């Protein structure tokens, strides 16, 4: 397993969505979970989100994967990134459990980019938490101070960053990276939803559920002078009754499990055929085999339920439950006598079907 | 014009929104504003949105405009109902005035219903207030206690309605309504907003206008025993984001001014051509001209701005765009000085030329 050398009250309390810092050796003897040609490689299918940019002569360039080849690119100033490669292979995903220590919730994905030297996206700032992880060979990074891709700006960072050097960015300070000597980064990214996002999510939940059905009422309807108007007591209702939907709670609760545990990225979903029937999955759980969630799939608790990809898991199993949401890996011993119950065990097959969680691999 | 001979205050404090009621000679004299054969003829249209409703031997059939013919329905059990005539018919929309003690916001459209001995639409509820007119003809109206289509009922109310009669009901109280001789009923019906109607709209504003574009933020991120987790605290800060932007104020009043001006039933929208320009506002008025609100187009002042049929209408000229909101039928003294403010009369020469107000037909 990798291991952060950071100290995380000092980073919580100091850096995180306040200051951009150079975690120096955050990572000791920083060996990368993937080569550039495997990137490549993942570059080439369809199902990845990927792409190339060049710079040449001042104009910048963007390409979109999937890329039939790389044949003529160029010695220099160029890089490929690629969105999620922790949805698509399992030794970056590991890369991603350090950083636990901030909530799962709050976390994306995991981007990896590689460029030859000169290679990089140029000057921009995110809306996102970011921690750039340093692999193989090494680039300059520079971070302005708090003002997509922005005027040259004053560096208040400007780093050589080496083999596990992390640099950690809140949203809003612009930065610039390029690559000195053909390089990895591997971006672990958060995710924050913005009130736009939320009311949204929330208005579509309502309309599939058919809830908030209840009418607006008036038999103490107020007077008023002209006939056309509408009075602020009547807006302050209406209002009322808006806000009041929005805080029915177990509503709330489950809206929000249901919207935050969808994914921003193609999971790769692969139903196993034929479907798992309950009795295997206990049989295989018994006999010592390990269940082991679908990279990049969101698995949150919210009280007392859990939800995984956009759907509710309720059950009498508490701790079984809670073993599904932290657990990435798990074993009958995370379940207990959970297992037992075959109502529980039922909906363990349906995750299973759906593709959430596989055996082994 | 027609005139209501209602104890106002009563009918308020008795009966809106809490109990149905005979207004016996609601109307004094009553002509229907329409007959049996220009409705029908309407039916013909296109545009018009109605329905014939007949029931033989137990079984009922629905028909949906626009029909061909007529020419062989029968003698009896059939109804053909046409809605928003008032859309399509000046004398019609006369009928609507008198309701103006209630507020034009809360008011929706005129509902037409013809129909032969044993006519009608059967048992049922609705989720509106309405007031059905008695024109030429009788029926039997039954309206039984709160509680679509309905088991039978015991009736708390059950009369004949005779020309000038009016039925109130308020919403959830069953009713059923059928004619004894040919009959024209005159539905004045009205429409509350239901909080998921509400919340759909001002979701769609709000991406339709990029706002709520603040992102949750967490520099003092609280610790967990499980990274899993989603605390309380954190749902708390989330759901005040949402309701923080439901009460910003003043994009609550656009918002809902938008979407409360808008109807139910198509307009009958057609645009000048050639478009007018300002000049010709201007002269047509000086000369006396009356300008014309269109049938069901609606029109409401919120605070300072007026919002007709979805757009929002500003000017520093207070009395005229008040005009614009009470007044259906305009003249110059309406607007006063107002045009001599040649940005308000480029607003109304748009408004014009959009087939809101069109010059006395
Ligand atoms: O890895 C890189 O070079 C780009 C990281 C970055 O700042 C971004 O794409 O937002
Ligand atoms: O005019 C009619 O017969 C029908 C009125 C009515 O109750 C309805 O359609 O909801
Ligand atoms: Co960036
Ligand atoms: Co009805």
Chains 1, 2 share one sequence.
Do not use: C
């Not at 980019?113 to 992880?133: A, E, K, T």
């Not at 499990?257 to 999955?281: C, K, N, W």
Request: proline share 8%.
């Amino acid at each position: 397993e990798y291991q952060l050398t950071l100290n995380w009250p000092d980073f919580l309390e100091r850096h995180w969505q306040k200051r951009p810092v150079v975690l120096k050796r955050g990572f000791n003897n920083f060996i990368d979970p993937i080569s550039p040609d495997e990137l490549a490689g993942l570059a080439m299918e369809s199902e990845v989100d990927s792409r190339l940019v060049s710079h040449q002569d001042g104009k910048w360039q963007v390409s979109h994967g999937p890329f039939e080849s790389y044949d003529h690119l160029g010695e220099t100033n160029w890089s490929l990134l690629v969105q999620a490669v922790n949805h698509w292979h399992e030794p970056t995903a590991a890369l991603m459990r350090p950083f636990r220590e901030l909530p799962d919730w709050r976390i994306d994905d995991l981007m990896i980019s590689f460029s030859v030297p000169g290679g990089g996206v140029g000057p921009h700032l995110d809306q996102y938490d970011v921690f750039i992880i340093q692999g193989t060979g090494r680039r300059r990074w520079r971070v302005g101070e708090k003002l997509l891709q922005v005027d040259p700006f004053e560096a208040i960072i400007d780093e050589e960053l080496e083999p596990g050097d992390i640099l950690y960015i809140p949203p809003g300070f612009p930065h610039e990276g390029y690559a000195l000597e053909n390089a990895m980064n591997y971006s672990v990214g958060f995710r924050a939803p913005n009130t736009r996002e939320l009311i949204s999510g929330f208005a579509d939940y309502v309309l599939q559920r058919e809830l908030g059905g209840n009418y607006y009422s008036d038999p103490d309807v107020p007077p008023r002078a002209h006939p056309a108007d509408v009075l602020p007591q009547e807006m302050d209702k209406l209002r009322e009754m808006m806000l009041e939907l929005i805080n029915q709670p177990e509503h709330f609760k489950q809206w929000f499990g249901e919207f935050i545990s969808q994914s921003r990225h193609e999971l790769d979903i692969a139903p196993p055929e034929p479907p798992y029937q309950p009795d295997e999955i206990y049989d295989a759980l018994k006999q010592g085999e390990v269940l082991v969630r679908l990279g990049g799939l969101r698995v949150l608790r919210i009280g007392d339920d859990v939800y995984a990809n956009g759907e509710k898991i309720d059950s009498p199993h508490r701790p079984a439950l809670d073993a599904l949401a932290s657990n990435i890996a798990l074993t009958a011993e995370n379940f207990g006598d959970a297992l037992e119950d075959p109502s529980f065990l039922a909906m363990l097959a349906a995750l299973v079907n759906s593709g959430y969680w596989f055996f082994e691999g």
